[PDB]
UniProtKB/Swiss-Prot annotation:
Disease: Okur-Chung neurodevelopmental syndrome: An autosomal dominant neurodevelopmental disorder characterized by developmental delay, intellectual disability, behavioral problems, hypotonia, speech problems, microcephaly, pachygyria and variable dysmorphic features.
Reaction(s) this enzyme catalyzes, per UniProt: L-seryl-[protein] + ATP = O-phospho-L-seryl-[protein] + ADP + H(+); L-threonyl-[protein] + ATP = O-phospho-L-threonyl-[protein] + ADP + H(+)
Residues that bind ATP: L44, G45, R46, G47, K48, Y49, S50, E51, V52, K67
Activity regulation behaviour: Constitutively active protein kinase whose activity is not directly affected by phosphorylation. Seems to be regulated by level of expression and localization.
Region span, Interaction with beta subunit: 35-40
Active-site residues, Swiss-Prot/TrEMBL: D155
InterPro entries hit by this protein: CK2_alpha (IPR045216), Kinase-like_dom_sf (IPR011009), Prot_kinase_dom (IPR000719), Protein_kinase_ATP_BS (IPR017441), Ser/Thr_kinase_AS (IPR008271)
Protein name: Casein kinase II subunit alpha
E.C. number: 2.7.11.1
């Protein structure tokens, strides 16, 4: 009788307990700023849905960053703006300063407070063991905060983390795919980038939750501690799950599919075949030796679980021994 329903283990009713205006972004009326307050200085980069510029607010002569959006539905613009406004001030969350429209073309643009143009993906393959732990913990702070505010990021990956390494500061960016979690709601499976998609997306299970982000985080952790970019290198959507199964084994995949009564495609079953689980230790080499510890492998094993309900929450992750010294060093700084 169709897929079994699912609920988030933590922060389940966070949005129910808030006023409707908190999460009803379609009803929200956007109050647009003045684009004439901002002059673009130079280009910083670009994405599938935006172009990113360094800019100056000439009313206060403050440096800012402007993300000019490509054409998308008004609903999605309103969603991203509401989410960013709701998370403003959160630990390690980018800070929206303004929203403007071009006077002529009416093209919308988001204005953020400035941070260092250093992408985590440019640094995370050369980190010390302790730096991997430290920056993982800072990402977790962002994820626990946004989940506690009822929001799933849904595009966690190295490219969406910015690092100011001199100040050991970190920001989670690119909230264009983020959504509010509501229990019982079915969500689009066309989220996250292929190498970071959780099994729930790859089997088209729509009643997912914050734990999607925890899978993506595990994929980042594995890539860093084994120096394999990406760790699960699928060449199409079905191959992404084949590659996962060649590591986690097919037994726990079929148990997951049965648990939620997921109806897989007949010959997707044949494609998956049968694969034994590999021990995590099998991906360690002489080069990454100093980055792999018992606690790292236990932590990774507890993030990369097929059953989304079995993965560590962000707070459970932050209390894992892998961060023990990290936590003690955060109390003295
Ligand atoms: C990697 C860089 C070019 N970049 C990208 C994005 C964003 C940035 C970026 C930078 Br740099 C800075 Br500084 C700030 Br502040 C902010 Br906000 C952003 C931001 O949102 C995307 O959203 C997707 C495409 C790549």
């Amino acid at each position: 009788s169709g897929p079994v329903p699912s609920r988030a283990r933590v922060y389940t009713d966070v949005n129910t307990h808030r006023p409707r205006e908190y999460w009803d972004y379609e009803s929200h009326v956007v109050e647009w700023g003045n684009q004439d307050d901002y002059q673009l200085v130079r280009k910083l980069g670009r994405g599938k849905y935006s172009e990113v510029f360094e800019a100056i607010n000439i009313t206060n002569n403050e440096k800012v960053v402007v993300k000019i959006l490509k054409p998308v539905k008004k609903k999605k613009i309103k969603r991203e703006i509401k989410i960013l406004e709701n998370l403003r001030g959160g630990p390690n969350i980018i800070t929206l300063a303004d929203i403007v429209k071009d006077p002529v073309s009416r093209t919308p643009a988001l204005v953020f407070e400035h941070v260092n143009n250093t992408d985590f993906k440019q640094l995370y393959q050369t980190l010390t063991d302790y730096d991997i732990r430290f920056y993982m913990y800072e990402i977790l702070k962002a994820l626990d905060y946004c989940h506690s505010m009822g929001i799933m990021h849904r595009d966690v990956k190295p490219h969406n983390v910015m690092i100011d390494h001199e100040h050991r500061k970190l920001r989670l960016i690119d909230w264009g795919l983020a959504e509010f979690y509501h229990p019982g709601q079915e969500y689009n499976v066309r989220v996250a980038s292929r190498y970071f998609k959780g099994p729930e997306l790859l089997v088209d299970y729509q009643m997912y939750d914050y734990s999607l982000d925890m899978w993506s985080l595990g994929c980042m952790l594995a890539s860093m501690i084994f120096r394999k970019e990406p760790f699960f290198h699928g060449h199409d959507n079905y191959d992404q799950l084949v590659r996962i199964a060649k590591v986690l084994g097919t037994e726990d995949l079929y148990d997951y599919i049965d648990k939620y009564n997921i109806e897989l495609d007949p010959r997707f079953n044949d494609i998956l075949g049968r694969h034994s689980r590999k021990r995590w230790e099998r991906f360690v080499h002489s080069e990454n030796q100093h980055l792999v510890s018992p606690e790292a492998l236990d932590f990774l094993d507890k993030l990369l679980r097929y059953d989304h309900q079995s993965r560590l929450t962000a707070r459970e992750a932050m209390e894992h021994p892998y961060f023990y010294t990290v936590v003690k060093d955060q109390a003295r700084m």
